[PDB]
Amino acid sequence: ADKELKFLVVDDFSTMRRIVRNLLKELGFNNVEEAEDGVDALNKLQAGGYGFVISDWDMPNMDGLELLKTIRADGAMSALPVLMVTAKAKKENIIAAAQAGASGYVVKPFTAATLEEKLNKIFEKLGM
């Protein structure tokens, strides 16, 4: 929490976005915006200031893999961390996300304790 980061939480289910935002609040991260799919996420990211993305995978309009690829291709935002979120209903194409440079993976639903452990692993390995 003594880390100043603006998060973007992306999920097409409003209920899950709110859960994740509230978990972040429990961890002391109070600057957290939501987006409902990858297209919406672009509009947020282009406004600037974001430091970490937590993105669902399967979404209407633009999915999380396409979002990840678009971020990684961007000359300013190419290193933005992206934690990919998958659901138990379907195992996603992890090989493609690994190829594209996902920062990590987590299966929803999860608690704040799990999220914290995941975030800290990413902070440590990327050096932020």
Ligand SMILES: [Mn+2]
């Ligand atoms: Mn989804």
